[PDB]
Amino acid sequence: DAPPLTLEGIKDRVLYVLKLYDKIDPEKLSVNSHFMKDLGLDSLDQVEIIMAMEDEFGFEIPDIDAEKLMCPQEIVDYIADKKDVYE
Amino acid sequence: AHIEPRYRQFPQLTRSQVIQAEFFSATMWFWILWRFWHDSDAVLGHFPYPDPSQWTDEELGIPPD
Amino acid sequence: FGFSIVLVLGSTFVAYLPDYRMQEWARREAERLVKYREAHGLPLMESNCFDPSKIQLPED
C-alpha cells in the first residue's frame, strides 16, 4: 500500500496549504518567493509553517535544516529528498 | 474497479461492505434479544434465592432452656 | 563420499543394529521371568539377591 507522488502535485499541495494560511495573500503566491525578502513574516511563523508541513507529511525535518528552507521551492526539494519520488 | 483516492473528502463506500457491516451488527442485536428472552433469566438463574434460613428460633431443633 | 555414501549409510546402520545392552533380549527375559514367578505364586523380585543361608556374617 504505497501510492507514489508527483512533483507537480506536491508543489500544488504545498502551495494549497500555504494559501489556506492567513497572513499571506493568494494574489502573489509564488513558489519562487522567499519569506524574509518580500513577505516579511516572522521566523516564528516560518517555523509554524514548517510544523504545518510536517503535520501534513508525517515526519520531522531537523533543526539544521529548519534554519535554511526560507522558500517553498526548497521545501518541495527537501520533501523530495525524504520521500524520493523521481519518476 | 477497486478504490480511487480523494483529497479531504468523505470516502466512497460500496453498498456491499456496508450492508454486511449493518447485517453483522443487526445479527448481534437479534441474537442478544432472542437470547435475553428465550431461556434466561441470568440475573436470577432460574432460582428465587430464599431468605436467610428461616428467620426462626424454636424450629429445626434448638432448646429454649 | 561424505553424504551419499557416508551419511545415509551410517544413518541406516545406526537406525537398526543388534541392540545395545541386550535390550530386547532383556525385555523378553523379564517377561519370561515375571510370568514364571507369577505362575509359581511367590512375589516377583524376591529381595536379598544373595542367599542369606549362604552367608557368613561376622558377629559382634
Binding site: - | - | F3, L7, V14, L17, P18, Y20, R21, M22
Partner: protein, 459 residues
Amino acid sequence: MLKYIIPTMMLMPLTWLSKNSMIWINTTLHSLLISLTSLLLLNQFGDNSLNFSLTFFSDSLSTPLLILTMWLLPLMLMASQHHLSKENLARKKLFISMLILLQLFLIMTFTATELIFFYIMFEATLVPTLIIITRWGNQTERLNAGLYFLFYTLAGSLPLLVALIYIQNTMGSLNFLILQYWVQPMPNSWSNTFMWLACMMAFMVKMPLYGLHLWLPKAHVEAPIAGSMVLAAILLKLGGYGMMRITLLLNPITDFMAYPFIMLSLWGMIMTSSICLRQTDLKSLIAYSSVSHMALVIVAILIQTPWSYMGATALMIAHGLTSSMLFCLANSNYERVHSRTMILARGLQTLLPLMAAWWLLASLTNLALPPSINLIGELFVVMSTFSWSNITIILMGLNMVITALYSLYMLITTQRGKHTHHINNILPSFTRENALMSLHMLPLLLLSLNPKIILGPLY
C-alpha cells in the same frame, strides 16, 4: 582398532608421495573412508565392553568419542584451506601430516590398556598441537599462548605419572579390568588426600577448571582453526574421559575432599558466564562458553550418579560438535573481514542469507535446542545435582539464563541490525562453508534422533 590404527600409519605417506594438486583429494577421501571404517566399530553389547587384545579395549564411553574424533578429522582437513593455499607445498604436507599424527595419538589415547599408556599418549596428544598453533598462530602472542599451554598442561599433568607408578607398585598391574576388580577403599589418611589431589588436579588442569583456565582463551584466539577445534573438542573432552576412567578407584574419600572442587566449578561457571556476557573479540566467546560447559561437566563427574555420567558424556559430545561448528563460523567471519572483533562486522542478514540459518542453528545448539543432545546433557546433570543437593538448582538455572543470554547476544551482535555499508569486500557465501556446516549439523540431528549411542557405559 589396530585395523583403525594401521590405516592412519598408511595415511601419512599418502600426503608425502602424492603430487601437486593431488594430496588434497586423496587425504580428504581416505580419511572419510576411515570415518566409515570406524563407523563399523559399535559392536558393544551387554555385560562388558568390546575388548580385544593386551593392546586394545573399547568402552561405550570411548566409542562415541573415538567416532567423533575420526569424524572430526576430514571436516577439519577440508576446513584448513584458504590460509595455507599461498604457502609452500612442503610446509602444507608438514601441516597435514602433523594433523594425521595428532589423530593417531588421539586414537592411541582413547584405546589405552593401562593408564601408563594413557599418560604417554596423553602428552603425545599434547605435543603436536603446540607445533600447529605456533607455526600458524597468525597473531603476535602465539608465543605466549603456546608457552602457557605447554607449561600448564605439563606441570599440572606431572604428578599424575608419579601417582600412577605408585598405584602400579601398590596394587599390581594397571589394566582397567583388574583395577575394576581389585579396587578397595583407601580411607582418610593424608597421603590418600595428596594422591587423589594429584590425579584429579592433573585432569582438572586438562579440563580446565576455573582456577587456571587462563591458558584457554589465548589458545583459541591465537590459534588456527584446525588446532582450535582439535584443542577444544578432543582435548578437553579427552580430559573428561580420563577423569571418568581414573575416578573408579579412590571412592571412600571423595565425600571428604570433593566439596571445594564443586564449589570452584559452580561459582566459576557463574563468573565465566558473567565475563563472556560483555567481552568483544567474538572468537573468545566460544572459548568462555567451553569453560562454562566443562565446568558443568566437572560438576557432573564429581557427583557420582549414573544419571550424572550419562548426562556428562552427552554434554561432552554435544559441546564438542557445537563448539567446532561455532569455531568454523568465527573462521568464516574472519575470512570475510580481517577483524576478529565483535562490533565491526555487522548486518549479514541481507548479505549471506543462508549463513543466517547456520548462525541461528549454532546459537540454538548453545541455547539448549529442546530435543538436542546439549539439553539432554544439561537436563540430566541438573537432575543428578538436584538429587545431590536441593539448593544448587539456583546456580544451574542462573547459568541457564545467562547461557541463553550470551548465546543470543553473540547472535544479534554480528548478524542483526545494520550492515555497516563501508566494508565492501565480502565475497558471497562459498559452497565450502555451507558444505562444512552440513557436515557439522546433520550428524548432530541424527544423534538427536536416536541418542542411545551417545549415552555412556551406564546406559
